[PDB]
DNA sequence: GGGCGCATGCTGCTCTAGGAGAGGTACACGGCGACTGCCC
DNA sequence: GGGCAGTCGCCGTGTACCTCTCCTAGAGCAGCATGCGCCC
RNA sequence: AAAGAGGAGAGGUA
């Protein structure tokens, strides 16, 4: 009975299904007949039997060594002569798929990628009507396709019809209808208005088929001899091969929909029937029927979804396409025998195609994964862009906005706030796409007022609802039977109206049907603003995994779903008892006797360097039952969503350190272990083999000292559970290289001598600047050892370090109604103002930035969890609670206080007066505040954005190849930029030495720094500077264009005409080193 | 954002040379200065100006 | 062009790396040398108008791409970058290189509040201090508690020794550093201020001087730049220290 | 003109 | 003072172009034109003799070091190797020094057919 | 059975080229200057 | 002759910062290591 | 003595 919400990773899993059981099978059978140029031996294809091989390789192998989890695809073959018989054949190994992941993602290179969802315009036949500068109503119609070429008519401001082929000039309609083959008279039998193109064959002509086949030519191929043949070429290649032009079975039937016509499904090209139906729409529309419409392209009935599957089979095609040729080639160029078709196929077009589509695609993105929502919420976007669809630069502005028919189906709330807002979306909780690719959304039938809540819920499209009253989902009833009250707000026609209880036919199932996933995690919701909960949504998905997660006391309802929908909670199979429980397995017996085993995850790495950790719940010889959770993972409680922790806070501000968005904690969250999270991190070598000599792992590393080798055993690998700081060494690896630096002499007579000795240079692997951690595993691949090393390569090592973080200062946190800020300050626990209980406060919070930013959902959240936390009772609300009453939270928060006030028997907890409001002292002087505060329990994140990894700083380093300036970068030492509007700002103070220095001695005068630093290090004065370098690049980039452009010397005296001046040449006999040096 | 920028730029560059570089020109012309009114509701008054 | 000015790098391991200059360079004389060929050897007038009209597209192709007829493709479908698109747009030479630079001496951070300062103060992490006072910190260790030339200074302080912490505290004072914020849509956007070195990694800021950076203490950065000659110190001091900017110039 | 050659800028402090 | 004055721009002459990438050496010979699209050698990286990155045009690609490896040192102020034509100084001239090449026909600037203004038509 | 000779698939060196579309098309929006039609 | 009016093509569209991946081209020709057949 | 070369996509923060 009831309603369950279906699974919400459904998309994926059934384009992946449809693709394996018929896209493959399909696309196989398009091509299979493959002949030669002149005569026999046919090449046959038996696409229905395509076995496959199992994986060579698991999911956990495939990531710890950088590979990809893929199956490989066999399909038998058969080539036959029909001339002297000797039919032949064999199985042909056609290339390797890359397999799917239970969780729906895909391992590529040892990286977690996804697959997001198209949205493009349906297939079909559109109408459209126009006006012009001085009126004169026009009217065009255009028929897309599939796949192929488009097809427009036009009509003219005097009443004649033309037909614009591609990107073609104008063409009468006449020469089109002709060269088809069609007479007058069938002409005639299918215009409902025949006096209308009467006025066309006028003023046009009539044309015979070769009449008609001539002009085509003529117009479709300027310059070129026209000939009936050709032009007959030309329709047959353009409107009916089907290799060229495809419509689908969404164009197929959306055409048999729109113009009333009743053609076969198998047929998926034009035909004469749908033009003369077009032609005879156009006309009827213009001549006003009124049964006739425009379309609306924004309309979600007119638009689709594509996904993974359907996305793979058109990169199929290609490959096919591609290895086609290929294979004809290969059949003709040889005039031999025995030509086998294991020796005939070439699988190098189809290993590439699929590997640059599951690579190097738009579609195709790296995976978010910093905790089990946001991976979710991955899953389920939609997208606009990519090949076939829209451009960032060419979109216009339509498309950014929302429309009447998204209501259900997609979430008008969840967006990105870049360049890119209104362009991808999520699919809303309840939405699911059928078979044809619309989106399709639930509702409740009534009959007489009567709301019918067991009667099968009816799915509806966008297009299918337009005709019906339909009511929202906050309509409140008697007994879940009749509705109440006199007037039912309804929508008709893309119109918000009002009615009355008997004229309505379907209902919303429920009040949050219209948001997504993430957006229905936050409680009292319909209290704050859209802005406010877009930023609270975005930012539930930066929040790291702590060690000892707590889920909230004051919920929705929707964590369990949530959690369990993304693969890391186990959960029992059958109603026995447990037999072995162990950190890394659990046993479960069943009352029949048969048992069933689990492992579980220990300390892995995640996409974002996060940790994965799975963690038993059950204890030995307990009784379990069906459904039961007995694992859960990182980011969960005991089967639910936990990303937080609840905390004491109170409203008011301290001594200036609240003062703008700023957060003041106590030094309790520090030493309790609450907010502390682990992080790992990887780093790689490898062992190449040079021109002039392989390079080695090796210990004996050259000019170091001792204590740089404790760490290290026998081959130089780092030992497991050491502690390194920055500088030590991982890996030591050293390089046989032959550098010429130095006077051969010496060198030839070691060399004649003897008494060879190390030649050999240090690059060994040493843990960069500001890390520190454990070394908790270290995997080495060789060869002779079945490994698929790069090549060019004989090594490869990985070493995996963990740390453990706690809270600072500089650190961001955050709650889910929008409120953020960074802490300013840690205070010692005898300092926090303290309750009558005596317990001290563990967040303290500016009130004045909740009137201005309008989230007044949060207090109604603390004063929820106070009660909670007081009763142990753990609520759950639903969002839009007010159809129930007027002042239904209120008074729920109200009740629940002073239930646990007469509970607890502590009169202290709620007050009559102020509710929300007790007495607070002051830690330092032990004086009450003038006033009561607002005092409860929050829940609250702590987000990706950790002051360790923002701070920089450079004095010099390296510098750019062309322009000479400083490098760009944290990660490679580089400097901060120096825009135009800060040197706007430096002119309009007035300072001209502060920017000329910043302009030359700073950034790319090659003379002048190292004069100005060895200058500061002896302590003289900064001589005065020269000319910077680019201005001399843009001289010789503006010279290669043969332009005479130089710079001149004004003549003192005399008649002397002025000299030209050589920029590029040496004024002091000085050094000019690449980079500055400190000289002796 | 974009219109502003460039409205910015545009007037940073039509007047990127005027700079003060003489004390006294000599000149007895000059503008005629009141208050902004909208009707009988004086919007800016004179002393501000 | 001078070959330094259009590297062709050597990564890739094997393999080199691609410039667009080089190919057009090599297409121009391709086709100049098939043309001398054809011509040496007496060919017939019909087959020679045709490299004439190639080698004209070529030169076209190599001034400035697109701007008659068709565009020279690479591998991808992507057209090259003639000598024209160099000093062009946005990313030309003369609005990325010319009116603004990438500049030595400089920091970023995240910004705090602090409470009990100074109008005129501000107050530095001892990392950023250390790196971005390096020259300064190395002329005083050589001076005074002589230690002897600069490999030993650079040593003491890679070593992280307790004086370098104390020569560093008075190597500082009286020296005025710069502070700016991402959009600077007028002149107070930048300003001059008195530094103090304190623990932790975030820089901590004046109420006071807030609404004219329009910051807010909920995740914003800042930009420290460091003068070096007498005259600019001289300069930020009397012109932009943060105590005398009282009034609007609007 | 003068930042682009890298010149003191006839304004301010480098007036004369 | 000053270094220059004033900068200025005109049309360029072949005299002119052929003048910025042609120098002479202490044998007879001229050298600057470029006849081969070959960079570098594929075996050992470096440069070839004639094509775009030769060392006898553009300069020496190491410092105080000829390319056939015969005369090294600083305490040469500007000889030329009599072997290869390499002038022994810093590789710094690879940014400086400029080439040309002689076309078999002439060719028309598009800059001065294809513009707003058309100065030939 | 076994060593040797030949066919053959695999793969790395080389060079050369470089043209012209195949079709990835139909796909933003405003301001200003330079040709061309069809009439008075 | 004298145009008006219409159409087509080129120019332009804020600032700083952080992380992840893939690619420097592609086909012909010859060297080589392997598999398989052959004669004793 | 040595040490990073550019380019193209995708996603974020003020
Ligand atoms: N496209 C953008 C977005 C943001 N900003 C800068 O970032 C600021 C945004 O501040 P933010 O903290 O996001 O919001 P506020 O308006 O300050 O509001 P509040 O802090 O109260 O949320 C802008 O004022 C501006 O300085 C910008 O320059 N360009
Ligand atoms: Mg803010
Ligand atoms: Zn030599």
Redesign the interface.
Known sequence: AAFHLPDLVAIQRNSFRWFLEEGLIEELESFSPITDYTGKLELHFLGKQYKLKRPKYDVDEAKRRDGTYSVQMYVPTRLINKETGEIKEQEVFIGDLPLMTDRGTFIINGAERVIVNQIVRSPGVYYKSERDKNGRLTHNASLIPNRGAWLKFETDKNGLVWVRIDKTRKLSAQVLLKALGLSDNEIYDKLRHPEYYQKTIDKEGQFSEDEALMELYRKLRPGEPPTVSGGQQLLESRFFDPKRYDLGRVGRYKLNKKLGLNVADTVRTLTSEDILAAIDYLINLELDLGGCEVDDIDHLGNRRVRSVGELLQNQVRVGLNRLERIIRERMTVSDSDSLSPASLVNPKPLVAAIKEFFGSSQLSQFMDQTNPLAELTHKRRLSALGPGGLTRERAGFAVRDIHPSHYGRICPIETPEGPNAGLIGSLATHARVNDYGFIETPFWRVEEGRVRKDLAPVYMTADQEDDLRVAPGDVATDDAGYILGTTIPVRYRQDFTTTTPERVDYVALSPVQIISVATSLIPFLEHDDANRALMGSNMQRQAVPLLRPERPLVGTGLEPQAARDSGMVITSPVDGTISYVDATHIEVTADTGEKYGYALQKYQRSNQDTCLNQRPIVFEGDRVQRGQVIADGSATEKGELALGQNILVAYMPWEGYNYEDAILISERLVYDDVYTSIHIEKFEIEARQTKLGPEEITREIPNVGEDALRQLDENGIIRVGAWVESGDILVGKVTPKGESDQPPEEKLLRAIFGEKARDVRDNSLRVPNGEKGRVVDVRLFTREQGDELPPGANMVVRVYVAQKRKIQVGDKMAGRHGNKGIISRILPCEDMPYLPDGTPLDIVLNPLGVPSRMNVGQVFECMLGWAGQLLDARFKVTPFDEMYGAEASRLTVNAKLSEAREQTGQPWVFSDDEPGKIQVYDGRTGEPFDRPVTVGRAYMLKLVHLVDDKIHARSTGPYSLVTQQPLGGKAQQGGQRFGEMEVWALEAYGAAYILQELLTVKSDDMQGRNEALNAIVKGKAIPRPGTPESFKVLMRELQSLCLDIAVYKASTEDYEEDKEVDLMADVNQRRTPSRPTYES | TADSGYLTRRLVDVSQDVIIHEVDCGTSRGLFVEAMTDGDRILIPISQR | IPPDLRPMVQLDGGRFATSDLNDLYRRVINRNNRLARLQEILAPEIIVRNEKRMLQEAVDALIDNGRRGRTVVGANNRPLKSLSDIIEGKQGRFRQNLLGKRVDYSGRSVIVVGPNLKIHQCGLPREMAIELFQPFVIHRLIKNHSINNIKQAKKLIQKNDPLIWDVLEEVIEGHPVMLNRAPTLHRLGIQAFEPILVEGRAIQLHPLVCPAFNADFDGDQMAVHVPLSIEAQAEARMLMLASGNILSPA | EN????????????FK | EQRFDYVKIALASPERIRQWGERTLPNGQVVGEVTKPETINYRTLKPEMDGLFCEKIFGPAKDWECHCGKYKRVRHRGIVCERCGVEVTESRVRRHRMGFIKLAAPVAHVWYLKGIPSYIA
């Open positions: 930042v682009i050659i890298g010149r003191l800028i006839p304004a301010g402090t480098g």
